[PDB]
Amino acid sequence: TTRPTDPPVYPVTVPFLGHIVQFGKNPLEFMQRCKRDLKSGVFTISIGGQRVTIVGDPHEHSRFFSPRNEILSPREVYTIMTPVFGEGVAYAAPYPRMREQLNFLAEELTIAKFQNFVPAIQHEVRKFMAENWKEDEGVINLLEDCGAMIINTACQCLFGEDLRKRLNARHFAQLLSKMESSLIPAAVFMPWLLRLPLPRCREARAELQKILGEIIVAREKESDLLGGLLKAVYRDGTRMSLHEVCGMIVAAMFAGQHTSTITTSWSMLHLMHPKNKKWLDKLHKEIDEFPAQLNYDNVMDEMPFAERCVRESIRRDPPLLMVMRMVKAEVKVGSYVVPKGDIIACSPLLSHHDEEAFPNPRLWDPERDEKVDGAFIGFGAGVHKCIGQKFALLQVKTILATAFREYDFQLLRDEVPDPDYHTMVVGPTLNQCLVKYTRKK
Ligand code: HEM
Ligand SMILES: OC(Cn1cncn1)(Cn1cncn1)c1ccc(F)cc1F
């Protein structure tokens, strides 16, 4: 079964690997085991004879990230999420409707769009803090409260008043919530591997669609994200259907909700920890210079340290652990060739723990730089680099800047939380994010 060019191979049984996943075993240790015993950063896990090739050598990142869809294809490997977004909507939109739709989305999230996003995000953060952090001091779940701030501020930024009246952020976040109710690794991993349907979350879509479809008529009967998606064309002259606009609105809120929530929480948890006083003080040296009301230029271009804070949070504990493609034509990676039919993967989690690229990788050090160019991949790279990355950072950084200007925070355990590997998109353990707020003097 070997070819003169293939990477080293580690056989596993499906049960044995199934067991590792179901039981939420640290996936970093398993991949680091493999990287060492096979003495290669590029290596294959043969599951049921089912080849998964990992680009775990940060010097080889571009070999994963740069090829076109026709060579390394995202479609086949994410097709299981189709019920999430709908049948002809993203990874399920046939060629070339997938790239066309992602690009429409991308175009709704450029820096020309962000106009008054910042004041809008500050007002929502301050409404929240005013409604929820009312006392001189009080106890909260930081993970839960960041997620609220993330949905509220996202919807305020992206949605018009008709939308926010019919579908409030609370509602939105429930509907989103009961979808990744069926995207746990323990349940998805095996049908993802076999090529089996997603094992409830199509009921939540049909609720949204009906709701949006009403909103959508109300408007055509009578410049936000919805309105921009509604104006989108396509190469062939036709526009997106209701079903496609709903699906891309979902893909959007879905993509950014859990990832940004988690990044904000890790950032705040590191910063508040007594051993990171130096950084919190550094953070203040930067943000104490600014007025009550921030602008785009303030947050995007005059907070380099806040940004390092966010970036290193995603570096140490990236929320998307692993990014995949189907190899459609064999591809050169390092001194190996990765054959047609392989699943090829590149893992932020694995590369962000490479000792050369990120020495002492468990130390959250905001002043760190990658020691191998392009080793950091928390938002991916190349053809499929994240296109909400700028909105994400504008959002998280404004929240950090707004929350730390008014409050101090005590973490109510001794150590920063354990990541919890039981969810698809990975964050700190919920019960471990209990925190005391203290209103500034
Ligand atoms: C902190 C927040 C975020 C993180 C950490 C993050 C992380 C990532 C990563 C690792 C990828 C690589 C995908 C791959 O190679 O398969 C990606 C892509 C992508 N992201 Fe994000 N992302 C974030 C926020 C968002 C937001 C807010 C949106 C939309 C509103 C978004 C939309 C997308 C899309 C459409 C792609 C891939 C497009 C394609 O397949 O060509 N992301 N993101
Ligand atoms: O890349 C994802 C899909 N994915 C990969 N593993 C689990 N889900 C996630 N993502 C990207 N940025 C933030 N989250 C994505 C790609 C496109 C999309 F529309 C949604 C979506 F979640």
Numbering used by the authors: 26 to 224, 228 to 250, 259 to 477
The authors write:
Trypansoma cruzi, the protozoan agent of Chagas Disease, is closely related to two other major global pathogens, Leishmania spp., responsible for leishmaniasis, and Trypansoma brucei, the causative agent of African Sleeping Sickness. Both T. cruzi and Leishmania parasites have an essential requirement for ergosterol, and are thus vulnerable to inhibitors of sterol 14α-demethylase (CYP51), which catalyzes the conversion of lanosterol to ergosterol. Here we report the crystal structures for the CYP51 target in T. cruzi (CYP51Tc) (resolutions 2.35 Å and 2.27 Å) and that of the closely related CYP51 ortholog from Trypanosoma brucei (CYP51Tb) (resolutions 2.7 Å and 2.6 Å), each bound to an anti-fungal triazole drug, either fluconazole or posaconazole. Nevertheless, CYP51Tc and CYP51Tb do share 83% sequence identity, a fact which has been crucial for successfully determining their crystal structures and makes it possible to extrapolate structural features learned from one enzyme toward the other.
